[PDB]
Design a protein around this ligand. Sequence first.
Ligand SMILES: CC1(C)CCN(Cc2ccc(N3CC(=O)NC4(CCN(c5cc(NCc6ccccc6)ncn5)CC4)C3)cc2)CC1
Lengths: 196, 240
Amino acid sequence: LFPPQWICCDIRYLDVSILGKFAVVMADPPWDIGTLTDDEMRRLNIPVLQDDGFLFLWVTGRAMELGRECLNLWGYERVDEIIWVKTNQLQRIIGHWLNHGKEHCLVGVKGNPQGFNQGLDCDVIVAEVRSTSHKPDEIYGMIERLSPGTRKIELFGRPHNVQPNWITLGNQLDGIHLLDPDVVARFKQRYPDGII
Amino acid sequence: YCQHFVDTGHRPQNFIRDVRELIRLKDELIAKSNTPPMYLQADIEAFDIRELTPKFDVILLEPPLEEYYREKCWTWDDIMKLEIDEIAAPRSFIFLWCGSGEGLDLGRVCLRKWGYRRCEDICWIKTNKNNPKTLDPKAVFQRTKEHCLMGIKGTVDIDLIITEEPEIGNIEKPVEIFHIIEHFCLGRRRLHLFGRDSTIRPGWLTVGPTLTNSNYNAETYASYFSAPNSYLTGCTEEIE
Ligand SMILES: CC1(C)CCN(Cc2ccc(N3CC(=O)NC4(CCN(c5cc(NCc6ccccc6)ncn5)CC4)C3)cc2)CC1
């Protein structure tokens, strides 16, 4: 079901096996740099979400190393790394040793994905800082061009993150909005009373 | 700008613009404090890293990665076996050029193997204004930057360098990295491993296989940091 979908939940406690398989996973975890401890992040059931496809993992500070650990633990190999150069509306550039002009997004591959358009975009995003702590909307166009029309899932999204072809998970979303019939079935089956 | 690059071939970084005038006094203090340039031809695979004394406050390490010639290359296997911890001062800094491939992972392994924690990830973003290639097999995206990892062991500037992409087969890294390093004021024993004739610079000891001349003498070099000059940051006045 192409339109946006989402599930308000605690990603720690949600049985993500009901969601099926995705060509792309994106996550912007609240690293303990409401957060999750390092063990909670290692323990996330990321491996069930894909057989063949890509993981996009925002990191910062010491999560640069921790995110690499999670990414490998979860079964991915890091094959690219996107940086977002943060600018204002005049295209000027806006840990303790250096001021941070950028944010990093790790890119991991699992399995053998086929039919993706690798090489269409480059690994640098230049885009205005919208609100605080928001990631740029360009990442979704980059991800659509790499894997058009496929199912994608975002972990730790917020209401502004919901997009067509995407299922957004986060505890600040308004309720449970699901349209994909296979998903609605397994959801009803695993949660007959509608409470995670 | 991501749509635009897809449309035209202009990397998004082509449209960044513009890429506290006391920085000049600091730069002059750095210049007065700088040791004479010293340099040594040495085959670093075969060279006993240890002859390089005294212990360094800063190490800039620029091994010739195979990916720099996608148009002797050192593998991360070779690099990881360097005895960098043997010549680093107990409080010291490393700046490691990692490229944009496996280096971003293998270079972190090296930093931990030699005893450092990564504290900055300095990113060299390459514009292509003057020419709007062939990807790594594993690549998902087109690679337009290189990473220089900053490590610390023991107890003004941005983390971005923006220049135009060098001509094919030019391996030089932007000289701006030296400005970032020197502006940290981390001490005066500065070593550049795998530098070249073209990177020799005041305040630095350069050691690399392609140097055509040497002037290095360990006793002469150590005399620049003998008392009362052992602990200068490189950013204060000369001791009278
Ligand atoms: C591109 C960047 C610069 C963007 C910013 N990032 C850093 C960053 C900043 C902020 C946030 N977030 C802020 C926000 O408000 N929400 C979340 C965190 C909470 N969250 C949860 C959490 C949860 N379980 C734990 C839990 C639940 C309840 C009580 C305790 C613990 N389960 C479901 N959703 C929903 C989304 C996102 C994420 C990342 C870096 C790169």
